[PDB]
Design a protein around this ligand. Structure first.
Ligand code: HEM
Ligand code: HEM
Ligand code: HEM
Ligand code: HEM
Lengths: 145, 141, 145, 141
């Protein structure tokens, strides 16, 4: 639940983001830092080593698609539930991903953005993006409620 | 319980941090308070506005403790004895708030150490902070 | 998510629960098993040991109220959010209780139901009440959303 | 770390299980599968209906490993050596599922042993299951 101030600041920040560079890193770090997440990605091939995961072509393309869904979310901050309805069905009804991991990926994305944007990723702006990630993780988990 | 692999990743990262430790601790606290408003209720005696002297000073205290911890990775229960009593028994800090500060700390470190914050180093720092969190949440009523 | 079938058995069973006893014990077990929860009850007097907590008259009086609210939720399984809106305000905006604790207290209530009713608190019935505690925990956490 | 202060509650309650370990293990598994459907997907080679001999037989294995853990409380990392690798490497069990099975186990024990399941014993069995779960998730590389 962002204010109009927070919505404008976070949407302005997202437009600047080169998603291609960020997406694959975020999902790669997910597979590396929380290795149980690899359970859902066996069709993706080599996930043996950290460099295998970070440089895996399918990890990179999938990460970009993940960020594209954030980009859509960015346009519907007051209807994240509807925006992620089909994705909630996939993650909950078909994949049975425990919803704790929705927070984990959002959090990993925030860490990646900080690595890339440094002091420009200010405590306020990061706080704004945390409300976005909290909102997205909830909407994805809705099929569980 | 931490691995030698994790320990050397942690030691190298914090070594890079060096004399920036206190500044980064103050930063991590600000990011916690603003990202997660519930954590502010632990600090009602504080001025929590940007650049306040209390958040600055408390940031130095927290970083000092992490320096101490980084130096006792074989025995965190032993080294964080008084802090465990403070956080668990006296202050009754909710364990999820440790995850919240831990995340804030990782955001801060990534921000300042972008070249040295590899996926491997990220994972080891997460384990280190989870390990410290466990000790600080270990000695409740 | 409670089906009509899930509603009716949960409702039939509930009539058996004395909520003087069950509420007091659940809130007491929350404070004993997860002692950080005691932060929120400074004013309740002595909470030092398992016996002092369990036999504390404020803990028993407050647990009665908690279970009175659950009894109210049980009457409104199709609208828990609206039912608990006042309690969400209080817990979230006034008291800033982390929502994770709402799940924890729900879980402890389930444990207490199991202890009190043994054989009758079947796997199927317990499964239904887990949907209810999930429902209550979410309704209470709504002011954070 | 599990506290030695908890051992007497653990061994006392778990001692009451006895010849019921396999019936209680099976019950706990069933309570897990019914309350928390996401857990079923780890077992697609199982029939998971009530009375299934797979759940019975598996419930026994779980119970029996807990029994061994109760007799090796000084060295749970060592006692659960092979289970650690299996759950964390081969099976890739999400850590949160250990909490869900742990809850299922407490529900089962409360139902069957209401007198032994006091507030203090409850707390000790919670720390015991949390320690077990830490060891079984400790080998993630
Ligand atoms: C912030 C939370 C998340 C977001 C926004 C998100 C987003 C997405 C999107 C948009 C897709 C569809 C891509 C397509 O149509 O090709 C997808 C697919 C998928 N997601 Fe997620 N996801 C999240 C969390 C997770 C987590 C935590 C896991 C596993 C632990 C996971 C596992 C998967 C899998 C296995 C697929 C299908 C991949 C394939 O085979 O092509 N997701 N996700
Ligand atoms: C990385 C984990 C943490 C570390 C290393 C840490 C370290 C410290 C240190 C060194 C002190 C000062 C002790 C003294 O010199 O008397 C302190 C105090 C305190 N901490 Fe933490 N802490 C951590 C987590 C937390 C969390 C998550 C919270 C709550 C959100 C918290 C709340 C407090 C409070 C309220 C004080 C008392 C400050 C005062 O009264 O001035 N701590 N901590
Ligand atoms: C299922 C979850 C819960 C329900 C249904 C519930 C219900 C209630 C009720 C009925 C009241 C009394 C309000 C009134 O009538 O004036 C109350 C107040 C309160 N609640 Fe809860 N509660 C829940 C969870 C929690 C948790 C987990 C905590 C903290 C760990 C908590 C902390 C408090 C506190 C501190 C008060 C005010 C006590 C006082 O000083 O009088 N609640 N809640
Ligand atoms: C208290 C924690 C647990 C204990 C003591 C435990 C114990 C065991 C044991 C003794 C085995 C058989 C090992 C062998 O054949 O060598 C096993 C296998 C297995 N476990 Fe666990 N486990 C625990 C938690 C979990 C959880 C939470 C899950 C997932 C929800 C899980 C999923 C599995 C699966 C899928 C197998 C293999 C199934 C089969 O083919 O029979 N375990 N576990």
């Amino acid at each position: 639940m962002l204010t109009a101030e927070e919505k404008a600041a976070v949407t302005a920040f997202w437009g600047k983001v080169h998603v291609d560079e960020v997406g694959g890193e975020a999902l790669g770090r997910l597979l590396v830092v929380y290795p149980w997440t690899q359970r859902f990605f066996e069709s993706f091939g080599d996930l043996s080593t950290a460099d295998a995961v970070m440089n895996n072509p399918k990890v990179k393309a999938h990460g970009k698609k993940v960020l594209d869904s954030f980009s859509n979310g960015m346009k519907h901050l007051d209807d994240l539930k509807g925006t992620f309805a089909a994705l909630s069905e996939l993650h909950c009804d078909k994949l049975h991903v425990d919803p704790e991991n929705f927070k984990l990926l959002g959090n990993v994305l925030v860490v990646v953005l900080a690595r890339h944007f440094g002091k420009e990723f200010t405590p306020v702006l990061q706080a704004d993006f945390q409300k976005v990630v909290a909102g997205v993780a909830n909407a994805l988990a809705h099929r569980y409620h | 319980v931490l691995s030698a692999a994790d320990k050397s990743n942690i030691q190298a990262a914090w070594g890079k941090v060096g004399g920036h430790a206190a500044d980064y601790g103050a930063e991590a606290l600000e990011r916690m308070f603003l990202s997660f408003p519930t954590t502010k209720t632990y600090f009602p005696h504080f001025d929590l506005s940007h650049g306040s002297a209390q958040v600055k000073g408390h940031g130095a205290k927290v970083a000092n403790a992490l320096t101490k911890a980084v130096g006792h990775l074989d025995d965190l229960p032993g080294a964080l004895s008084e802090l465990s009593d403070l956080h668990a028994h006296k202050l009754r800090v909710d364990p999820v708030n440790f995850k919240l500060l831990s995340h804030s700390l990782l955001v801060t470190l990534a921000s300042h150490l972008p070249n040295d914050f590899t996926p491997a180093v990220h994972a080891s720092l997460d384990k280190f902070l989870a390990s410290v969190s466990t000790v600080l949440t270990s000695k409740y009523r």
